[PDB]
Coordinates of C-alpha atoms and ligand atoms in Angstrom, one line a residue:
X1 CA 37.5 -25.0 -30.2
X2 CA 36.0 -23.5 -27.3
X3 CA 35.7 -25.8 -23.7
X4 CA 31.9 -26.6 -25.0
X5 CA 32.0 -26.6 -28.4
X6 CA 34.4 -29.7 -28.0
X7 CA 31.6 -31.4 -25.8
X8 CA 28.7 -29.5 -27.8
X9 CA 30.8 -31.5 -30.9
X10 CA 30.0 -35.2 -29.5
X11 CA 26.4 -34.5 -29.4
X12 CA 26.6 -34.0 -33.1
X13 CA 29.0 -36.4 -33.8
X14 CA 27.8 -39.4 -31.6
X15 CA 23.9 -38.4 -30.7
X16 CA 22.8 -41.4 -29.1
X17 CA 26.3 -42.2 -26.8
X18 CA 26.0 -42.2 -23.5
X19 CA 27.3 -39.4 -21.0
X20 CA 26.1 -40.0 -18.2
X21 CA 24.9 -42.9 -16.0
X22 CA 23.5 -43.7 -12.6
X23 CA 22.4 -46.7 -11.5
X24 CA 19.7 -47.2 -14.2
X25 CA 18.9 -43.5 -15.1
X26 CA 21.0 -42.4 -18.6
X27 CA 21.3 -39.5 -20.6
X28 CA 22.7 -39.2 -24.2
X29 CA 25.6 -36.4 -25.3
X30 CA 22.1 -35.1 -27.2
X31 CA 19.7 -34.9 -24.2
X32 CA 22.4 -33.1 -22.3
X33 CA 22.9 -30.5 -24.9
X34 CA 19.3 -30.0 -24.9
X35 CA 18.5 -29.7 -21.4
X36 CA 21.5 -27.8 -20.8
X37 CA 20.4 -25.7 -23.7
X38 CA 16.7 -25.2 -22.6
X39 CA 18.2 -24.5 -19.2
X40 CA 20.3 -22.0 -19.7
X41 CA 18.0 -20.3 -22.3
X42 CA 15.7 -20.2 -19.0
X43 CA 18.8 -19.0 -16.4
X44 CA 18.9 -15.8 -19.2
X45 CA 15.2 -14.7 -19.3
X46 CA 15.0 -15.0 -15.9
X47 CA 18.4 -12.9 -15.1
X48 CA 18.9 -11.3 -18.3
X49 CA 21.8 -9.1 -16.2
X50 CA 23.1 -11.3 -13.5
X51 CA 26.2 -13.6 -13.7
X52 CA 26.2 -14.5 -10.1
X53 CA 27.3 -17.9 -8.9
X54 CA 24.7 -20.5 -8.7
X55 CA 24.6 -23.6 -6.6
X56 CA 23.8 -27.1 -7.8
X57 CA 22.5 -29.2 -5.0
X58 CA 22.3 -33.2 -5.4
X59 CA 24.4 -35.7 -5.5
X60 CA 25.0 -38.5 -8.3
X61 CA 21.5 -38.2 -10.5
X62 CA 22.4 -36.3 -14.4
X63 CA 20.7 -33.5 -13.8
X64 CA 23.9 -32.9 -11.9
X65 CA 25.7 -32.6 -15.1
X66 CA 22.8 -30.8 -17.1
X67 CA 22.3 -28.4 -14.6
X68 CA 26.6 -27.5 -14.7
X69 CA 26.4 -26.7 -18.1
X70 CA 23.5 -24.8 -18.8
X71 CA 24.6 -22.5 -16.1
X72 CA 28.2 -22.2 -17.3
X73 CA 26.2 -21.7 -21.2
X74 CA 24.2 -18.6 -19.3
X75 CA 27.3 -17.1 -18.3
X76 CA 27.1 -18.5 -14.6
X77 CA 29.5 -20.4 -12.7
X78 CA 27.9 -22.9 -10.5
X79 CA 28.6 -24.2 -7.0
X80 CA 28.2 -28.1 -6.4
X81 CA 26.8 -28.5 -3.4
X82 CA 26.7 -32.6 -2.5
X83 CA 23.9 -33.9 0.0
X84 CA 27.0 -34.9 2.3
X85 CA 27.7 -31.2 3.4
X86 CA 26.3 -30.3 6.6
X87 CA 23.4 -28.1 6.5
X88 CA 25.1 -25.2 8.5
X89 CA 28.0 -24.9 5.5
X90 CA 25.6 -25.2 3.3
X91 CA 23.5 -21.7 4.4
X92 CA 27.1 -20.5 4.7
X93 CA 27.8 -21.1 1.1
X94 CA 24.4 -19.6 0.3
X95 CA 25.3 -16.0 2.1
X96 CA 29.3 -16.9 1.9
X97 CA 28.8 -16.4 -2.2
X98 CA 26.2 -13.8 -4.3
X99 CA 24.1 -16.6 -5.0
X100 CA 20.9 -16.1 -5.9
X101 CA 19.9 -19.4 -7.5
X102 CA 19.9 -23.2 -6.4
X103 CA 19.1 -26.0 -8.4
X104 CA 17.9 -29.3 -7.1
X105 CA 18.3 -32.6 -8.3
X106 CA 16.1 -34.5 -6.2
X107 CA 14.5 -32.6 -3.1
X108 CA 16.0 -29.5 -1.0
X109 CA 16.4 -30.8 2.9
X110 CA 18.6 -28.2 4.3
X111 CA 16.5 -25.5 6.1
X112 CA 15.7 -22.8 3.5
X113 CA 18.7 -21.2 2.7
X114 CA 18.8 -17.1 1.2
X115 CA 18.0 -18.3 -2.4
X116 CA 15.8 -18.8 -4.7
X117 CA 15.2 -22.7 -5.1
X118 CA 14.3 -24.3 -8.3
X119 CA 13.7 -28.3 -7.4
X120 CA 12.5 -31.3 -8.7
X121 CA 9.3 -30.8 -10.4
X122 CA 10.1 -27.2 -11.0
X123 CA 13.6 -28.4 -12.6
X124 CA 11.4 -30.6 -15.5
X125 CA 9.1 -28.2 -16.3
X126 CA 12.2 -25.9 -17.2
X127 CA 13.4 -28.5 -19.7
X128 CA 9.9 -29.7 -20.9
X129 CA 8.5 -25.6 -21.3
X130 CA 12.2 -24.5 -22.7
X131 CA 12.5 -27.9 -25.0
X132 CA 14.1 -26.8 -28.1
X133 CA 15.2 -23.3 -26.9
X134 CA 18.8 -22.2 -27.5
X135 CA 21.2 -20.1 -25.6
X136 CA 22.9 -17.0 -26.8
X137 CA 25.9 -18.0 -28.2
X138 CA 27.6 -15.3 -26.6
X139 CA 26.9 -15.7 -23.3
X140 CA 29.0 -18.8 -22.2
X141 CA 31.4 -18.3 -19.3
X142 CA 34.7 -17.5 -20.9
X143 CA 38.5 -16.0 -20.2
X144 CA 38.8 -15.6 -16.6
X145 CA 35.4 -15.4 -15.4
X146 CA 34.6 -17.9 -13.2
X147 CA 33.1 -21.5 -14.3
X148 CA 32.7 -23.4 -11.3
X149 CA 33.7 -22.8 -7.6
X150 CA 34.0 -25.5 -5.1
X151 CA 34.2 -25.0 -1.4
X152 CA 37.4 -25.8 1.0
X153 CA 36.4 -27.8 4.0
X154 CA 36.1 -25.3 6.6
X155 CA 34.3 -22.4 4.1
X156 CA 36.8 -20.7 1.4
X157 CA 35.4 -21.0 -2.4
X158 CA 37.9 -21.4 -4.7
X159 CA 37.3 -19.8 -7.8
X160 CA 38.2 -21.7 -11.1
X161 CA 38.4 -19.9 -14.3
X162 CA 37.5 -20.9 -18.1
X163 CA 40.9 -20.2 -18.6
X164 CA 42.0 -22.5 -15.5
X165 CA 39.7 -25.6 -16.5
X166 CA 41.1 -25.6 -20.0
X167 CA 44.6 -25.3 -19.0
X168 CA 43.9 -28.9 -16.5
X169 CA 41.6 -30.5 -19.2
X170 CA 44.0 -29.8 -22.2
X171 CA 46.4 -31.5 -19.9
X172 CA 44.8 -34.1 -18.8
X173 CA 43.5 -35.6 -22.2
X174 CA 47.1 -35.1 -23.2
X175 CA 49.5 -36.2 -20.6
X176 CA 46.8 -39.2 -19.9
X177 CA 46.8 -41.1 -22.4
X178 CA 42.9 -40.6 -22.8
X179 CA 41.3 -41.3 -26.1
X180 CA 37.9 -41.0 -27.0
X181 CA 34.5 -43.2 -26.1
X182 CA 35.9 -44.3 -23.2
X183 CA 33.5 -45.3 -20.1
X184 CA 35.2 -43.0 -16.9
X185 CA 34.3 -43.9 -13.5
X186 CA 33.1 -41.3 -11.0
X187 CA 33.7 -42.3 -7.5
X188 CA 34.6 -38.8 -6.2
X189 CA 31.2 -36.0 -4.9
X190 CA 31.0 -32.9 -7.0
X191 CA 31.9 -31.2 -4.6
X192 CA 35.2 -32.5 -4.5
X193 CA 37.6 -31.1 -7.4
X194 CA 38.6 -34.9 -8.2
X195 CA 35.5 -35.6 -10.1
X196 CA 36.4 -32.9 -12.5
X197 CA 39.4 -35.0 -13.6
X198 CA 36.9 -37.6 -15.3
X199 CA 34.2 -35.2 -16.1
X200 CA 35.5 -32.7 -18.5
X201 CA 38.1 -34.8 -20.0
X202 CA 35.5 -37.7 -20.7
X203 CA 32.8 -34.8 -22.0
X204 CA 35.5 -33.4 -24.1
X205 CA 36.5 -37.0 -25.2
X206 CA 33.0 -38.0 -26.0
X207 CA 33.3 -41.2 -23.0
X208 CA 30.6 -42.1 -20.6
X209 CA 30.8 -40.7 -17.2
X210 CA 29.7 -44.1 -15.2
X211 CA 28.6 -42.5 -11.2
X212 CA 29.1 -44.8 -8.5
X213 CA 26.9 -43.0 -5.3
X214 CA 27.2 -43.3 -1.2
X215 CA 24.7 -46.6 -0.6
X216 CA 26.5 -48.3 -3.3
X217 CA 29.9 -48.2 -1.8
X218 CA 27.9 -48.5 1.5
X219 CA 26.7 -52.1 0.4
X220 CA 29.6 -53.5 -1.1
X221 CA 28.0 -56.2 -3.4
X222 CA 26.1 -53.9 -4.9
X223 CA 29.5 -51.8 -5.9
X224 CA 31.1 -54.4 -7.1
X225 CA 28.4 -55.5 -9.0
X226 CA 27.8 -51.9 -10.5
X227 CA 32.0 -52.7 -11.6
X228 CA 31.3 -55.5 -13.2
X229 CA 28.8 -54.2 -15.5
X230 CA 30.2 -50.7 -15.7
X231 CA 32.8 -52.3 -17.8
X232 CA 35.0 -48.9 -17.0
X233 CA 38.3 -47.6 -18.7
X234 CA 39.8 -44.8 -17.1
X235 CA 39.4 -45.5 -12.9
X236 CA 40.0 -41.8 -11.1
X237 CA 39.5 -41.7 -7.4
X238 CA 41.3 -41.1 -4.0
X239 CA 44.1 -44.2 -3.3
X240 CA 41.8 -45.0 -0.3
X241 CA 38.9 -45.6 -2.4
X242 CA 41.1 -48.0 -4.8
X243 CA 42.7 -49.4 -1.3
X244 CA 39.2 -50.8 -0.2
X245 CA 38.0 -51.9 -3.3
X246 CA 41.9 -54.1 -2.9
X247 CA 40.4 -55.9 0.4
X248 CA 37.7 -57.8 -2.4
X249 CA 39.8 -60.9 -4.0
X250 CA 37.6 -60.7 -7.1
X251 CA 38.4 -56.5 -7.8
X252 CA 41.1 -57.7 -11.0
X253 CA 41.3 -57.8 -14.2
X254 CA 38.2 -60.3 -14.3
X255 CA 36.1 -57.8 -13.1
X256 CA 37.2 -55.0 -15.4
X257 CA 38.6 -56.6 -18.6
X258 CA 38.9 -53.7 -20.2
X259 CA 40.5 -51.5 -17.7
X260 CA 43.5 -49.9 -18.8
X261 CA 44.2 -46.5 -17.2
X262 CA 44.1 -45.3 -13.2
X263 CA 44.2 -41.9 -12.0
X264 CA 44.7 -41.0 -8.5
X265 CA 45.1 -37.9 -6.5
X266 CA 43.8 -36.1 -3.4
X267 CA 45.5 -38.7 -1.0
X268 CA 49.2 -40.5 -0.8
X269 CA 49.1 -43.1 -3.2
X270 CA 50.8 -46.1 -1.0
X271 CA 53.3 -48.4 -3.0
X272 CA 51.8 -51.2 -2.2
X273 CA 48.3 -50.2 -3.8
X274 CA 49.8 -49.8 -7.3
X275 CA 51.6 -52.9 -6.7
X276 CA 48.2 -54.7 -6.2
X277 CA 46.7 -52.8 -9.2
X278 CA 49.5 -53.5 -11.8
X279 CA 49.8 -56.8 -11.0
X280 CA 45.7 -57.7 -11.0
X281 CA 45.5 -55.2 -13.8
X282 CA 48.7 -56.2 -15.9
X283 CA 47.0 -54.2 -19.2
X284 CA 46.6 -51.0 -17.4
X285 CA 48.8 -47.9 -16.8
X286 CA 48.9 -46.3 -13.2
X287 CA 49.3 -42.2 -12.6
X288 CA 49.7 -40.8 -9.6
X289 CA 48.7 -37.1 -9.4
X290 CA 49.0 -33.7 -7.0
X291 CA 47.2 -30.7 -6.3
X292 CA 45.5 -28.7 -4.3
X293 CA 42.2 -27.6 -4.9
X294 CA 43.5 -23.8 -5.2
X295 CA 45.7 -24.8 -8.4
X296 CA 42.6 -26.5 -10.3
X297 CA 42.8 -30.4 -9.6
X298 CA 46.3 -31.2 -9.9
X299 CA 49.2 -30.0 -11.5
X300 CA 51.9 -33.0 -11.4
X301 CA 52.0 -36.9 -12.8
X302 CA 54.0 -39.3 -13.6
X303 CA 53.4 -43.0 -14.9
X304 CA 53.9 -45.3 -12.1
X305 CA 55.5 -48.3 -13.1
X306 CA 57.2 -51.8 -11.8
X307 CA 60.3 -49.7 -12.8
X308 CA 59.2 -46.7 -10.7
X309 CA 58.0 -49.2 -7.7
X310 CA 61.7 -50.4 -7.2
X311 CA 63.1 -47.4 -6.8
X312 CA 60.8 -45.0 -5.4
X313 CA 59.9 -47.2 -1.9
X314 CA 57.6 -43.7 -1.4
X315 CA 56.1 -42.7 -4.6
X316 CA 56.8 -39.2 -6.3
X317 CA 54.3 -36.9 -7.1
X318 CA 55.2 -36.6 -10.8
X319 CA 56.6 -33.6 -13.3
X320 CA 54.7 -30.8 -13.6
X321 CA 52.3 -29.6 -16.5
X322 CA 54.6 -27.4 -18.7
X323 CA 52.4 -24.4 -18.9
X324 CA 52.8 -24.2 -15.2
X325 CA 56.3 -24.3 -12.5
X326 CA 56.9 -25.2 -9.3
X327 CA 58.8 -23.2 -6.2
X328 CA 60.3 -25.1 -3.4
X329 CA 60.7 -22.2 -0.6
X330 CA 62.6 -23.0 3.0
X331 CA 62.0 -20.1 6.2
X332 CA 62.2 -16.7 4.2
X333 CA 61.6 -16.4 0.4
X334 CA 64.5 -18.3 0.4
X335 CA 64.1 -20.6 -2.9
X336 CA 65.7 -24.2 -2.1
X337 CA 67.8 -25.7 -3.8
X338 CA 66.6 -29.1 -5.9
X339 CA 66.8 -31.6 -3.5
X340 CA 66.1 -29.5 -0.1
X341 CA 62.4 -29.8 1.1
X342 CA 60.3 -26.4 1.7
X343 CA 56.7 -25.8 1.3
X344 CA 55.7 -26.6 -2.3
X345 CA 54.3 -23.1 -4.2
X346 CA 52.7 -23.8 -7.7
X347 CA 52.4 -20.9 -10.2
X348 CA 50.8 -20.7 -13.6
X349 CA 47.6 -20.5 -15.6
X350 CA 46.0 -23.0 -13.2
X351 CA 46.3 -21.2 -10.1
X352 CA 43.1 -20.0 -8.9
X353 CA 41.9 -16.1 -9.0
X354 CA 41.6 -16.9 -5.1
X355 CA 39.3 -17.2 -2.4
X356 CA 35.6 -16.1 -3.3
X357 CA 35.3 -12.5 -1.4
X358 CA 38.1 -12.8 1.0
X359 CA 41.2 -10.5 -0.1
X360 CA 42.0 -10.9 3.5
X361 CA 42.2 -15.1 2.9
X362 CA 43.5 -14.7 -0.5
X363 CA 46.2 -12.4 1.3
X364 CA 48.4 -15.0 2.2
X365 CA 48.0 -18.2 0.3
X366 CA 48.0 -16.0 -3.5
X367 CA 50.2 -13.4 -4.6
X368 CA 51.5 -12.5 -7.7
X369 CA 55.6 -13.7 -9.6
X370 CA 56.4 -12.0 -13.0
X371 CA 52.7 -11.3 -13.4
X372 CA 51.5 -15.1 -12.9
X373 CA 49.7 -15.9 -10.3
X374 CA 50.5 -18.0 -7.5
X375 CA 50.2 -20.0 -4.7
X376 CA 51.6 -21.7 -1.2
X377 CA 50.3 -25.3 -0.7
X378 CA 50.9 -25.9 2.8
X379 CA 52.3 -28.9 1.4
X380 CA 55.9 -29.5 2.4
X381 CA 58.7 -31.5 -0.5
X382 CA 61.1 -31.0 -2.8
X383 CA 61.8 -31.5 -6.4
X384 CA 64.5 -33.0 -8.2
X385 CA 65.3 -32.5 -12.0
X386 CA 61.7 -31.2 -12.6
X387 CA 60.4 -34.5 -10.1
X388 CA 58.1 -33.4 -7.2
X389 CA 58.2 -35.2 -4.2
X390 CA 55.4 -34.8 -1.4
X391 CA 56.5 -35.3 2.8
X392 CA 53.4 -33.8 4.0
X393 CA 51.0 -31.0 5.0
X394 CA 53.1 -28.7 7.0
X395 CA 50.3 -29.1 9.8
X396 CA 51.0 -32.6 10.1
X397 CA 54.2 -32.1 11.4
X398 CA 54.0 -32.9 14.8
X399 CA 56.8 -32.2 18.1
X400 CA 56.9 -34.8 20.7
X401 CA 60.4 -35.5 22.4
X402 CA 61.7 -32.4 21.2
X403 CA 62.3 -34.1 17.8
X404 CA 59.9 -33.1 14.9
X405 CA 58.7 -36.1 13.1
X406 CA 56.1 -36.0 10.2
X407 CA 52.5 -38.3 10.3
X408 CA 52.8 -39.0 6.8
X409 CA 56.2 -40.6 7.2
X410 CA 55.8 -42.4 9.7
X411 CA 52.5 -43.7 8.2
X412 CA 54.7 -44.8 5.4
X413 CA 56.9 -47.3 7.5
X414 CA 54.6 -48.0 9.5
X415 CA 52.4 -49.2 6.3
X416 CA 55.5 -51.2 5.1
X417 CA 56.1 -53.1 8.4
X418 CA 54.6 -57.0 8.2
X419 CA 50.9 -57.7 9.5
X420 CA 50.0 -54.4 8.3
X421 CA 47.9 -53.7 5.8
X422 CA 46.1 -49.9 6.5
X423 CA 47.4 -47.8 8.8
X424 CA 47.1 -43.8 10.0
X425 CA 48.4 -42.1 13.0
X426 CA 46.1 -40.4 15.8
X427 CA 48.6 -37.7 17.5
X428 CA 47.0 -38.0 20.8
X429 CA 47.6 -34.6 23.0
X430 CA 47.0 -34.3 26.5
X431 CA 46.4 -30.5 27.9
X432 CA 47.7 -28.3 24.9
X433 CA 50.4 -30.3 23.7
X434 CA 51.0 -34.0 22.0
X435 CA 51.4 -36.9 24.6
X436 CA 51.8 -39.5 22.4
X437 CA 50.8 -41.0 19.2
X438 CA 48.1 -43.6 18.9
X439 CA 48.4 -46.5 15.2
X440 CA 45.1 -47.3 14.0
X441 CA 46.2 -50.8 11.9
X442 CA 43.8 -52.9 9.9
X443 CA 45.7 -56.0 10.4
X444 CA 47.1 -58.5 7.5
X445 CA 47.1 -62.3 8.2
X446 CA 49.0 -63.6 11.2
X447 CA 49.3 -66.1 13.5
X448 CA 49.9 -64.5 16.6
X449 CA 47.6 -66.0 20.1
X450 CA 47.7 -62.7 21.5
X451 CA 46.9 -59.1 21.0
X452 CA 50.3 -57.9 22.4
X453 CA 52.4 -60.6 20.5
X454 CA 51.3 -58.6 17.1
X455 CA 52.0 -55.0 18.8
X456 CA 55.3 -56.0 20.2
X457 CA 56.1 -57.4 16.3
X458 CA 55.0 -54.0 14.7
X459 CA 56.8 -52.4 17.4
X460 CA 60.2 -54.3 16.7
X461 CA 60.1 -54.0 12.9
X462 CA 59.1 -50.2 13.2
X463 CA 62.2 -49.6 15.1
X464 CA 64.3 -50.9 12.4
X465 CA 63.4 -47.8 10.3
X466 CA 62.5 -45.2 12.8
X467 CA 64.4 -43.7 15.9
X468 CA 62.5 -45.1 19.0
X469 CA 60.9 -42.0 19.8
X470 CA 58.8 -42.2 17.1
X471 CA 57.3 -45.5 17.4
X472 CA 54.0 -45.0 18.3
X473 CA 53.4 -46.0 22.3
X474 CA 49.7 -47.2 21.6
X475 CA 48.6 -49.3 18.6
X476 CA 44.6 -49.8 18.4
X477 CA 43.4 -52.6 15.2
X478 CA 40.4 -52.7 12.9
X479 CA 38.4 -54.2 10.2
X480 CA 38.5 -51.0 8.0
X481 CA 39.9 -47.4 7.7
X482 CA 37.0 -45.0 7.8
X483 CA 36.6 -43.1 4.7
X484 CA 34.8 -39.6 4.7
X485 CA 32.5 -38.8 1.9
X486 CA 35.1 -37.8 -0.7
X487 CA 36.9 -41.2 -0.4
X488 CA 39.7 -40.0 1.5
X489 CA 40.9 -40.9 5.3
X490 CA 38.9 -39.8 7.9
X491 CA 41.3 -38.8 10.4
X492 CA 38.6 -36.9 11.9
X493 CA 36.5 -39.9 13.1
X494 CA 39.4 -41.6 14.2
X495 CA 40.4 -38.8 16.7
X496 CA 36.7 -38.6 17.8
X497 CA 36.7 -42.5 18.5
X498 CA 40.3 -42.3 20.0
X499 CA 39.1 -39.6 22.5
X500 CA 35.7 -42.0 23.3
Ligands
LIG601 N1 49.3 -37.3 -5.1 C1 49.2 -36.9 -3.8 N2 50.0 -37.5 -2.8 C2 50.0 -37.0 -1.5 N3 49.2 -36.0 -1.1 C3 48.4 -35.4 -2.1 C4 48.4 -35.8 -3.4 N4 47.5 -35.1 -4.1 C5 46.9 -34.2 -3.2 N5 47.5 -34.4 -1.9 C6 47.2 -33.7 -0.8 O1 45.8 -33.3 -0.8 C7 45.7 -31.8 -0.7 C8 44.8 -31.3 -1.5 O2 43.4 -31.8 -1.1 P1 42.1 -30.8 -1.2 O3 42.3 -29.8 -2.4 O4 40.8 -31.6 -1.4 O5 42.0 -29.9 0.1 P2 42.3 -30.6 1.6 O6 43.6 -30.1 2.0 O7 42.4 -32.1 1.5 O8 41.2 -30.2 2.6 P3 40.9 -28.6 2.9 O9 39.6 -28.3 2.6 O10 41.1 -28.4 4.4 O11 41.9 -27.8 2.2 C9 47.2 -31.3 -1.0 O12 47.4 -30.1 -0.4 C10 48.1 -32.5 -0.7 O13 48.5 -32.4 0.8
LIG602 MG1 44.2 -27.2 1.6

């Protein structure tokens, strides 16, 4: 069955279920097939010849969902545009892409952009004057054309096909362990590719996507109070996000009861986490996940267990989907062998058709191997008997001392060293090049009278795993690690706040 007629199929089969939820606005598997119908029915009569992209602007509200689907049902892919991106990116996107169309969830701030913006009140009186109305049938986004295209920090819009979302979603429902009428928790924007890892395969599963916005995690009683009540099955965020919601004692089993499967990608998933999580969720199964946006989601997993824990001290990035393949390549084209590291290149039906009008972009991250396409991460690892394992971004590999060290390992031991409990590394570089490197710790429990007692600790277990010229010369503590909108670590801030 086609992509919608599997979700089209739970608003036969379970009407009145719940697909989405936000804070106390709900919508049922029928209301969204009947707004997305009377809103795509509306998309065609007013662009009875145009396919071009068009941008969803909001953030956590339903019409977020409604509005994906009746553009996809008119043939259109959409572009989810969350309030959290800048204004400037966001005319960008508008020019960057042919859209012609934006649809707002709750009201259009950003300085009018070159589109035509349907908002609010004009939104309802789209779904109230099309009530009933039907799209053609024939119109639906399909094969290769484009269903949905999300934006790479900065501005490249990676295209993602029908073809693309049903190779991820048929793997994900599969290799998950998903069932169906399952509540899925949606930590991650729309406008980061993560949320599409609950959305489709709860839609397609007939569950109940249950949104958790920006003030909530902002005000953390209010989060964990949305938790309790969620009563969520299938948890997919960014490790941070899981990491922070750790730091509350009550986060367990209590709170969830019924949790029983986690999904996490986007970010390293730290050892220690998943030890946390399988121990105060003893009923529920832990996957850890890769991708880059660029190969739809992710394209690896593997079950991480107690068994996995003990031997893995850094966690693998799983086996990948078997529609798909992965290339570990050193210098030249030179193919490693299993067990060497090289940047990681995915190839297969999830790759994306490339950038959105930018051959010269899609020049060197795509080409084409035995007529599948393909792509170059960026990301450095190897693989061994079909097991990917992830070092790092090939940017993060820093040269200090004329010895090459990598951020993300050194995060790692620094992360297992005692008294730590969050850590990141600020590469600190004076003129053009790196002087040093700064560790931003959020401190565990300890004893020690003085500031430089702890640092001179860290410092001395640090240096039983790593040479000495990679122990970091300045160590800086806090209450948190800042998280940027999508969940993940906001090295970004940390730099700025470093540098002030
Ligand atoms: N399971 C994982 N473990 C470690 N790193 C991961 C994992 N999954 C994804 N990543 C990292 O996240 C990246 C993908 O994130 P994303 O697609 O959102 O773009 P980004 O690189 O984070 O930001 P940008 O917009 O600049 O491209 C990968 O390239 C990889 O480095
Ligand atoms: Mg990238």
């Amino acid at each position: 069955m086609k992509l919608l007629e599997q979700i089209e199929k739970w608003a036969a089969e379970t009407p009145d279920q719940t697909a989405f939820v936000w804070r106390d606005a709900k919508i049922t598997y029928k209301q969204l097939k009947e707004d997305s119908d009377a809103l795509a029915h509306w998309i065609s009569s007013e662009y009875p010849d145009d396919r071009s992209p068009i941008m969803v602007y909001g953030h956590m509200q339903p019409e977020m969902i409604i509005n994906f689907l009746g553009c996809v049902k008119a043939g259109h892919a959409y572009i989810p545009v969350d309030l959290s991106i800048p204004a400037d990116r966001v005319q960008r996107i508008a020019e960057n892409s042919g859209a012609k169309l934006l649809l707002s969830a709750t009201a259009v701030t950003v300085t009018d952009l070159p589109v035509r913006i349907v908002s609010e009140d004009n939104l309802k009186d789209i779904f109230f004057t099309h009530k009933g109305n039907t799209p053609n049938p024939e119109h639906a986004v399909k094969g290769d054309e484009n269903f949905y295209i999300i934006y790479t920090s900065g501005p490249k819009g990676v295209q993602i096909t029908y073809n693309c979302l049903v190779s991820f979603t048929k793997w994900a429902v599969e290799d998950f362990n998903l069932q169906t009428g399952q509540v899925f928790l949606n930590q991650a924007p729309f406008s980061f590719d993560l949320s599409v890892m609950d959305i489709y395969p709860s839609l397609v599963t007939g569950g109940t996507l249950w949104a958790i916005d920006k003030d909530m995690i902002a005000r953390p009683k209010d989060l964990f109070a949305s938790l309790e009540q969620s009563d969520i099955q299938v948890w997919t965020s960014t490790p941070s996000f899981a990491e922070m919601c750790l730091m509350e004692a009550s986060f367990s089993e209590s709170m969830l009861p019924n949790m029983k499967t986690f999904l996490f990608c986007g970010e390293v998933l730290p050892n220690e986490v998943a030890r946390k999580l399988i121990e105060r969720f003893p009923k529920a199964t832990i996957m850890n996940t890769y991708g880059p946006t660029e190969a739809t989601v992710a394209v690896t997993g593997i079950h991480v267990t107690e068994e996995v824990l003990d031997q893995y001290k850094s966690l693998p990035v799983g086996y990948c989907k078997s529609d798909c393949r992965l290339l570990i390549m050193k210098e030249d084209g030179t193919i490693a062998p299993d067990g060497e590291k090289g940047e990681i290149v995915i190839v297969g039906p999830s790759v994306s058709v490339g950038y959105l009008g930018s051959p010269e972009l899609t020049e060197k991250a795509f080409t084409m191997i035995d007529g599948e396409r393909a792509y170059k991460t960026g990301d450095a690892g190897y693989v061994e008997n079909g097991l990917l394992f992830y070092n790092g971004r090939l940017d993060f590999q820093i040269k200090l001392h004329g010895y090459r060290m990598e951020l993300e390992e050194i995060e790692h031991h620094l992360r297992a060293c005692s008294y730590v409990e969050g850590a990141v590394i600020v590469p600190i570089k004076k003129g053009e090049k790196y002087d040093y490197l700064l560790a931003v710790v959020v401190p565990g429990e300890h004893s020690f009278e003085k500031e430089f007692k702890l640092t001179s600790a860290i410092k001395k277990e640090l240096n039983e795993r790593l040479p000495n010229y990679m122990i970091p010369r300045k160590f800086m503590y806090q209450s948190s690690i800042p998280m940027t909108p999508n969940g993940k670590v906001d090295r970004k801030k940390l730099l700025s706040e470093v540098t002030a």
